[PDB]
Amino acid sequence: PAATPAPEIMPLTLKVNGKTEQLEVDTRTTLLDTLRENLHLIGTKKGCDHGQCGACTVLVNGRRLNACLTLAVMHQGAEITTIEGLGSPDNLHPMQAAFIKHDGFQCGYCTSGQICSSVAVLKEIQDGIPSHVTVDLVSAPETTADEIRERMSGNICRCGAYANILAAIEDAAGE
Amino acid sequence: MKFDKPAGENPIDQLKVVGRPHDRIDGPLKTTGTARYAYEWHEEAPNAAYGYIVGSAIAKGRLTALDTDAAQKAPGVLAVITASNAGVLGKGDKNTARLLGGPTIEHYHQAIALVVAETFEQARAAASLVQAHYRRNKGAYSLADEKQAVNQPPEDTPDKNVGDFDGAFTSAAVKIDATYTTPDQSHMAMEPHASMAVWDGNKLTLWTSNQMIDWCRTDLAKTLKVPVENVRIISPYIGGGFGGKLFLRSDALLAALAARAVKRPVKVMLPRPSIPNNTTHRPATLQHLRIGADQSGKITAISHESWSGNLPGGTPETAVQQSELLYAGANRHTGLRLATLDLPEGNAMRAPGEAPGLMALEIAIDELAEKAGIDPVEFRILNDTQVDPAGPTRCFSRRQLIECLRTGADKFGWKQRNATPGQVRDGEWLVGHGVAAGFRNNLLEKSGARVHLEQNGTVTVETDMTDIGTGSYTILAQTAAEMLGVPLEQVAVHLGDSSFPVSAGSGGQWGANTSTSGVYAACMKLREMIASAVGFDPEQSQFADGKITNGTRSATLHEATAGGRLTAEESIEFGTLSKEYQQSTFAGHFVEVGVHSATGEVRVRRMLAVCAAGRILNPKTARSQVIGAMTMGMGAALMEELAVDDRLGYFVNHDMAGYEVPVHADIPKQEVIFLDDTDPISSPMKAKGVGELGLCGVSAAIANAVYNATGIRVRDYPITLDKLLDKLPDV
Amino acid sequence: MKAFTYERVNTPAEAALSAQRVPGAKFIAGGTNLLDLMKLEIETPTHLIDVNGLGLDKIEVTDAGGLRIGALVRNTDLAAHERVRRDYAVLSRALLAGASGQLRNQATTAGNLLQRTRCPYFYDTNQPCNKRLPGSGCAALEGFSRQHAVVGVSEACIATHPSDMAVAMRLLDAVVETITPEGKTRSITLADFYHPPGKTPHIETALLPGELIVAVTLPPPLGGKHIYRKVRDRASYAFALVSVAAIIQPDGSGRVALGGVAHKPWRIEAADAQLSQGAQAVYDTLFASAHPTAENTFKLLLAKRTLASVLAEARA
Ligand SMILES: Cc1cc2nc3c(=O)[nH]c(=O)nc-3n(C[C@H](O)[C@H](O)[C@H](O)COP(=O)(O)OP(=O)(O)OC[C@H]3O[C@@H](n4cnc5c(N)ncnc54)[C@H](O)[C@@H]3O)c2cc1C
Ligand SMILES: Nc1ccn([C@@H]2O[C@H](COP(=O)(O)OP(=O)(O)OC[C@H]3Oc4nc5nc(N)nc(O)c5nc4C(S)=C3S)[C@@H](O)[C@H]2O)c(=O)n1
Ligand code: SF4
Ligand code: MOS
Ligand code: FES
Ligand code: FES
Ligand SMILES: [Cl-]
Ligand SMILES: [Cl-]
Ligand SMILES: [Cl-]
Ligand SMILES: [Cl-]
Numbered sequence A: 001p002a003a004t005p006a007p008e009i010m011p012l013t014l015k016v017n018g019k020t021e022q023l024e025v026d027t028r029t030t031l032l033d034t035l036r037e038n039l040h041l042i043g044t045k046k047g048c049d050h051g052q053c054g055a056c057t058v059l060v061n062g063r064r065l066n067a068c069l070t071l072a073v074m075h076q077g078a079e080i081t082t083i084e085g086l087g088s089p090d091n092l093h094p095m096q097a098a099f100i101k102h103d104g105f106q107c108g109y110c111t112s113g114q115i116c117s118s119v120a121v122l123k124e125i126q127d128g129i130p131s132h133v134t135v136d137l138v139s140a141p142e143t144t145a146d147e148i149r150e151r152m153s154g155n156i157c158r159c160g161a162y163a164n165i166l167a168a169i170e171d172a173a174g175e
Numbered sequence B: 001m002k003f004d005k006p007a008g009e010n011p012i013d014q015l016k017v018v019g020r021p022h023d024r025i026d027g028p029l030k031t032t033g034t035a036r037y038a039y040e041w042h043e044e045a046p047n048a049a050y051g052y053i054v055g056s057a058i059a060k061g062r063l064t065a066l067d068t069d070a071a072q073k074a075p076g077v078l079a080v081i082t083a084s085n086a087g088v089l090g091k092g093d094k095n096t097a098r099l100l101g102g103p104t105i106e107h108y109h110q111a112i113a114l115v116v117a118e119t120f121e122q123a124r125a126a127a128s129l130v131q132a133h134y135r136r137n138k139g140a141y142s143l144a145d146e147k148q149a150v151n152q153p154p155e156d157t158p159d160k161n162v163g164d165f166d167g168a169f170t171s172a173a174v175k176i177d178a179t180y181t182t183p184d185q186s187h188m189a190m191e192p193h194a195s196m197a198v199w200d201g202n203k204l205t206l207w208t209s210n211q212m213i214d215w216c217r218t219d220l221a222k223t224l225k226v227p228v229e230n231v232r233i234i235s236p237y238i239g240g241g242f243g244g245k246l247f248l249r250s251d252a253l254l255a256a257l258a259a260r261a262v263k264r265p266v267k268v269m270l271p272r273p274s275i276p277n278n279t280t281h282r283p284a285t286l287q288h289l290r291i292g293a294d295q296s297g298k299i300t301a302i303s304h305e306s307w308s309g310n311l312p313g314g315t316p317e318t319a320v321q322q323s324e325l326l327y328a329g330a331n332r333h334t335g336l337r338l339a340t341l342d343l344p345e346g347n348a349m350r351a352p353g354e355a356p357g358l359m360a361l362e363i364a365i366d367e368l369a370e371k372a373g374i375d376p377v378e379f380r381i382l383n384d385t386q387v388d389p390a391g392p393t394r395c396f397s398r399r400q401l402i403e404c405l406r407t408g409a410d411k412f413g414w415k416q417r418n419a420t421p422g423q424v425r426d427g428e429w430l431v432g433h434g435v436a437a438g439f440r441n442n443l444l445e446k447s448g449a450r451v452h453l454e455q456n457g458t459v460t461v462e463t464d465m466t467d468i469g470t471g472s473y474t475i476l477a478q479t480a481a482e483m484l485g486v487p488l489e490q491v492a493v494h495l496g497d498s499s500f501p502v503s504a505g506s507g508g509q510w511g512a513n514t515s516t517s518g519v520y521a522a523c524m525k526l527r528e529m530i531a532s533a534v535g536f537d538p539e540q541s542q543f544a545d546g547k548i549t550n551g552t553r554s555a556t557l558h559e560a561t562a563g564g565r566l567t568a569e570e571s572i573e574f575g576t577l578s579k580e581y582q583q584s585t586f587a588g589h590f591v592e593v594g595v596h597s598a599t600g601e602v603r604v605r606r607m608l609a610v611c612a613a614g615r616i617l618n619p620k621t622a623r624s625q626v627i628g629a630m631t632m633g634m635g636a637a638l639m640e641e642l643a644v645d646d647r648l649g650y651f652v653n654h655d656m657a658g659y660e661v662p663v664h665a666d667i668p669k670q671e672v673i674f675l676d677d678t679d680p681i682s683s684p685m686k687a688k689g690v691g692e693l694g695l696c697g698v699s700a701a702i703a704n705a706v707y708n709a710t711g712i713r714v715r716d717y718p719i720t721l722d723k724l725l726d727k728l729p730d731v
Numbered sequence C: 001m002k003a004f005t006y007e008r009v010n011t012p013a014e015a016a017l018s019a020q021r022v023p024g025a026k027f028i029a030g031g032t033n034l035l036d037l038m039k040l041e042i043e044t045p046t047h048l049i050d051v052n053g054l055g056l057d058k059i060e061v062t063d064a065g066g067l068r069i070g071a072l073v074r075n076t077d078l079a080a081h082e083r084v085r086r087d088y089a090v091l092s093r094a095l096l097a098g099a100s101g102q103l104r105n106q107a108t109t110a111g112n113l114l115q116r117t118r119c120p121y122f123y124d125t126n127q128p129c130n131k132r133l134p135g136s137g138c139a140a141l142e143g144f145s146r147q148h149a150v151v152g153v154s155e156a157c158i159a160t161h162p163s164d165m166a167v168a169m170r171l172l173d174a175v176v177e178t179i180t181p182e183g184k185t186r187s188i189t190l191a192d193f194y195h196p197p198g199k200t201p202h203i204e205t206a207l208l209p210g211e212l213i214v215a216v217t218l219p220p221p222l223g224g225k226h227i228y229r230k231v232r233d234r235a236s237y238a239f240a241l242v243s244v245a246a247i248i249q250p251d252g253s254g255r256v257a258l259g260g261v262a263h264k265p266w267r268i269e270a271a272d273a274q275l276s277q278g279a280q281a282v283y284d285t286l287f288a289s290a291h292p293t294a295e296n297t298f299k300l301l302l303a304k305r306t307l308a309s310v311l312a313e314a315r316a
């Protein structure tokens, strides 16, 4: 029309990588944009903003999700874990170290997402969650290459580091 | 340093650090979310405003009005930038379409306005209120419809003729005449194009996502009409480009204009849905190949014509060049035909010209080999040329295509292929094996660097070269470490900033070889300076283990800088060896595919690439390049297409769901072998490009494997199941 | 995206009451379709009512021996549930065939039913689309229609319903349970839930203004061999070109439903009744009314061949 409404601003408490944050946010703000623009936790990336790429993957109460497709205000009091919460250069997570060893990235832009997903995927398998490639639906899935490829398919890498990403995940899973 | 004679023995030959599969030195930053990309520089502008792009709603016509009052009044809005209020602009030499449209609209989603606001959400919301009204004009959107009318080459690009093609084709014992198409393709780099601008008086700093720092600086300055000296460009980390970030795009221009108008830093990202039409794309091609051979299978006649389209003054897709050099044949014709299309700007994407040219040529060769009754690997070997076929006194610098193919065939188990198509099943899957050649020239460009030996013994490399995920940080560190005799972990490398010396940038797969060669040049001077500091002749001095030695005497790098740091700044320049010799790179691609006998779904089972790309500088990051290119070739072969609506004049499936790139589940076993192809004609590094070579031939090897699986030739890519379904077996 | 007020409530009844009290209010569950559309201003609600955390997220056996699935159950949790995997396998298969793990983690039962089409002209607000703007035309009809519907279509809209889960729900005779703002409850069979496009492709479902879906009820298990075969150009993270959901019994009788072919899951009882006669017979009944475009005509042959492949899998 000839006008668009002013922001509705709400108080929000998030626990992000172990730390209590108290924010005032526009209700429209996604978890992705709250992390990046409000909290300056720029490790979580924006590849598409419409759920198509996985570059914004984070963990919310342990479960992976695409942070571009959830509102910050939907997660009052939740525990959020981003790539920064998994490790840093002087204290690398085993999955970060595995990605380095196997060269599971090139440009680095999908990598935060790949790593957060990888960690969650191993846990989803441990939890007995099946996938599209699980043949025996009633029994517990095994950690196989096929299972990992399917369960990671929501993280797109345009560089095409996939084969190395799989090698990193399998190394990390074996340890 | 002027490189005009082939390289002799030099320090890089020691290969203590160069040639070794070192971890990427940017790995700790990139795996921990601490590498900063263009939209992430918060400390540099903590109160940066947000600009949100408005793109043309029509393909082509006139912007009758562009009203901004409602947007200006929207919550949090600071200003709205338009062509009308931005002032007269220049145009960069690498932009065909204007980066800011109005009053003329040249393509769908061409930028026409930017709303600047206090927050992202407020900017986005206000952008919906910008009132654009248009008068459409008639456009040309179908390459196929335009073909009939273009039968002459561009003025500056005349056809190339050798011997008597027409006569020889008539005389040939066995021949093919076939037409092939490739669609418009999109880069889909995972980082959306983005930039942040800050002005300090008349000085501009732009943080951006760009492959070519110096071109960016020059082009942005020309567009803004400001002195180039007043512009600093910064792009140390780039989330992929694949050609799509070679040039200045609308994000950079609009950020810069906006920040100057509101007297405050502004950052602008192109939203993913706007990228495929706003930016550039690989042009679709329509290619006609006529190839004949004699009774022994020697090609005698080769003709390759290609049609592509672009906006007026835009580039053709150079899809016939490889056909001038790849196979022997005394009678040859090649030609380009360029239509005018009012789609978005066509431009470079990974291996421009060779990627689609080989997508056609390498099927045609498979067809001709089949017709001749000759194994397709043997057929290519039989037709190898070690000289330029148009100038047989001109040698390739070196050429190991035969060896790529033989090594590949052996490793892949090519002899286990059933040469009769359609006879091999694995459950419900038809299995097939295919091969193709890859080819890509090696190009040389001037490149410079500054290298410092610090007082603590560490080495600092500065150059404006970019690392777009290629590995430049690492290979430049390896080069300096090798030259100075220091451990890799003692070298710091600073990239992608116009305050550093001018490199050749990331493009044309010249980046690794040229950037490392400039570091070579700087290090040779630094070695002289070190030698002089300790009183040795550099001609007789060796550098190893943090020491310099000369016959009987020894000294430590520490001692040489007791006086202060030593700094060398040099460039490499290239003479006429690329005219004297043809410098190229080669591959053999071998693929096994499965085709579902019921549904026609295509799934790749195994891929092998064998590459000859000079001396490999880091086999781990080089392998990544090739598997990455293998994946992008799978895309091109099986799923990637920008769907043209030839009424509305745009690419329809314009996002990261509609335009389909390969996902984890698509990826087979991928193996890469690098032949030792050390090429002293190339440079002091003896390296050649690989990042584009890796893609060349991949898609046709997949197509040829699909043919071997099914017996169905598909000559219009991508090869999707709807092109196979009605010729599969009965269920 | 237009600014909106955001509301948490204490019960489902409060949510439905608020949706009635507030013009332009919408419910938000996973957000995985609604937020996508809101960013583009295709959906422009003034007010969002969060329906997570209202107790609508249980999976329970019913007294009749079937299953009551809460509207707000996460698609991952529904696919993973022991009883669903064992006794309603085709539903687990269909869920796992869709989207990605991140999206399945947040997507919900009712949200999935209510996801909208993936038509690219619908998504591009510069293009003609009757669904978005009644009477503006249908750009897909003579444009890019490879991904569009082949049966149940009208001259006004050839869009498909994209859900994999909904195809299995239709196969299983699922019933949508609601509460109305008036405070009454309704049951709508999924077979009656999706409206044909006709001359009103902007009207998609049987829900009334502010009606809240609280559960989906399944009947007792059917046994048999459950199969969900999804055809797509790439191996994962893509919507169906065609899909076939089947439950096949030891005698070769059974039932089938298809995705990727219509504005809703496509199933005909008379066609189910012919399964023992083979894929050609079933196809002929299912697609007697087909009206494809040139670009999507291949889906007809694909459906027949996929059905044939599915029945061969069941026989093996
Ligand atoms: C890139 C991508 C690919 C995908 N691929 C697949 C695919 O292969 N297959 C497939 O099936 N799905 C796919 N999806 C779609 C996804 O499964 C749906 O977005 C999701 O199921 C929606 O559930 P939700 O809970 O997020 O809904 P929401 O986005 O929260 O809401 C959807 C609509 O439901 C309304 N609503 C919500 N809950 C209620 C309720 N209880 N009562 C009444 N109204 C309600 C909302 O107001 C809204 O109109 C894809 C998603 C993306 C982003
Ligand atoms: N003899 C050689 C040559 C190359 N390399 C390895 O390969 C990389 C690529 O070097 P090169 O082939 O010279 O390519 P450029 O440096 O010129 O980079 C450009 C190139 O890079 C390519 N690969 C890319 N890969 C990543 N991840 N992302 C991009 O945008 C890409 N763009 C494509 C495109 S298009 C092009 S033109 C090196 O950094 C090095 O890791 C090596 O070890 N030895
Ligand atoms: S098909 Fe239905 S949705 Fe896609 S454009 Fe025509 S109306 Fe708009
Ligand atoms: O030459 Mo690569 O950037 S198309
Ligand atoms: S940015 Fe969230 S899926 Fe792409
Ligand atoms: S690393 Fe560049 S996109 Fe995966
Ligand atoms: Cl308003
Ligand atoms: Cl987890
Ligand atoms: Cl090593
Ligand atoms: Cl030496």
Ligand SMILES: [Cl-]
Residues within 6 Å of the ligand: B021, B619
């Ligand atoms: Cl090695």
Ligand SMILES: [Cl-]
Residues within 6 Å of the ligand: B021, B619, B620, B623
């Ligand atoms: Cl290696």
Ligand SMILES: [Cl-]
Residues within 6 Å of the ligand: A048, A049, A050, A052, B272, B273, B655, B656, B657
């Ligand atoms: Cl998108």
Ligand SMILES: [Cl-]
Residues within 6 Å of the ligand: B652, B653, B658, C120, C147
């Ligand atoms: Cl699409």
Ligand SMILES: [Cl-]
Residues within 6 Å of the ligand: B619, B672, B673, B674, B675
């Ligand atoms: Cl090797």
Ligand SMILES: [Cl-]
Residues within 6 Å of the ligand: C130, C134, C135, C156, C199, C200, C201
């Ligand atoms: Cl209508």
Ligand SMILES: [Cl-]
Residues within 6 Å of the ligand: C267, C268, C269
């Ligand atoms: Cl029925």
Ligand SMILES: [Cl-]
Residues within 6 Å of the ligand: B730, B731, C279, C304, C305, C308
């Ligand atoms: Cl059949």
